[PDB]
């Protein structure tokens, strides 16, 4: 999906300043490229309500919604 999430600053830089309003998260342990087969259980009603009304839209009408 190409979604990017910035999950904080690396804990190696925790000493770069004595007082910063940042969330330090440890460096990931595994490899850079991670593969995992997963399963999710959903109901048809969940799909119904997901498609009932637009969500995540950046348009002003979606923001008002």
């Amino acid at each position: 999906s190409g979604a990017v999430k910035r999950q904080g600053r690396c804990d190696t830089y925790a000493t770069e300043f004595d007082l910063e309003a940042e969330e330090y998260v440890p460096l990931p342990k595994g490899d850079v490229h991670k593969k995992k087969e997963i399963i999710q259980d959903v109901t048809l009603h969940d799909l119904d309500v997901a498609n009932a009304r637009p969500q995540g839209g950046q348009d002003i009408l979606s923001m008002m919604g």
Binding site: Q7, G8, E23, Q58, D59, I60, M63
Partner: protein
């Protein structure tokens, strides 16, 4: 078509106003903070072309000032002065109003602005040079309809006055 009759009638101020309660947490989650931040950013970016409209159509009426009409109606002297000034203005005359009280001069200022009459105020706190400058301006500028002077001001420094009518508001 109601705008003029709307603004004469919009007067209710709420007895209490309060900002929305703010949900306070220690250690707010990064995801929640980011979602709120982007939501607000998007709303401000989309509202920017219409922001003043939102401001005017949402801002509540918090203050209620007394109408300038009340200054004239609270004093019979101001009413009789209004009638006198209207009659004198119709005759193209210039009027000098003398009062002993500074606060009364301020009330006369509010009264004259309510009647859209141009005026110059000379009190005792104006220096002699300022008093001469203001009187020379009054004599020069024939458009100034009234000059309001404090009786306690040293009027002995004003020799020439190009006005034909003097009104003593108080003794």
């Amino acid at each position: 078509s109601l705008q003029d009759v709307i603004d004469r009638v919009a007067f209710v101020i709420p007895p209490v106003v309060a900002a929305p309660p703010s949900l306070r947490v220690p250690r707010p989650p990064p995801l929640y903070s980011h979602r709120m931040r982007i939501l607000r950013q998007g709303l401000r970016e989309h509202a920017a072309p219409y922001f003043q409209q939102l401001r005017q159509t949402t801002a509540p009426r918090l203050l209620q000032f007394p109408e300038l009409r009340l200054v004239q109606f609270d004093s019979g002297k101001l009413e009789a002065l209004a009638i006198l000034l209207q009659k004198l203005k119709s005759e193209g005359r210039r009027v000098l109003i003398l009062s002993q009280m500074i606060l009364m001069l301020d009330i006369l200022e509010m009264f004259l602005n309510f009647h859209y009459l141009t005026y110059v105020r000379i009190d005792e706190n104006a220096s002699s040079e300022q008093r001469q400058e203001l009187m020379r301006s009054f004599n020069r500028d024939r458009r100034i309809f009234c000059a309001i002077l404090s009786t306690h001001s040293r009027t002995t420094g004003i020799n020439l006055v190009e006005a034909d009518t003097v009104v003593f508001y108080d003794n």
